[PDB]
Amino acid sequence: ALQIPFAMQMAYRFNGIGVTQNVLYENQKLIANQFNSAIGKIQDSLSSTA
């Protein structure tokens, strides 16, 4: 395991899907909020029904 800052790991995962990595850093707070909101909805989704 080679340590790397998490924003730079996401930059190189965006760079893996044909999006130029500046699209992440110029939107980092918005992308973090979209992820944090989406993972929040999983707890309600799993809570709703077996």
Neighbouring C-beta atoms of residue 25, cutoff 10 Å: 13
4, 1, 28: which is closest to 14 by C-alpha?
28
Among 13, 19, 28, 35, binds other proteins (CB under 8 A): 28
26 lies in the binding site for other proteins (CB under 8 A): yes
Among 1, 17, 18, 20, binds other proteins (CB under 8 A): 20
Q: Which is nearer to other proteins, 26 or 40 (CB)?
A: 26
Non-local CB neighbours of 15 within 8 Å, separated by 6+ positions: 21
Footprint of other proteins (CB under 8 A): 5, 7-8, 12, 15, 20, 22, 25-26, 28-29
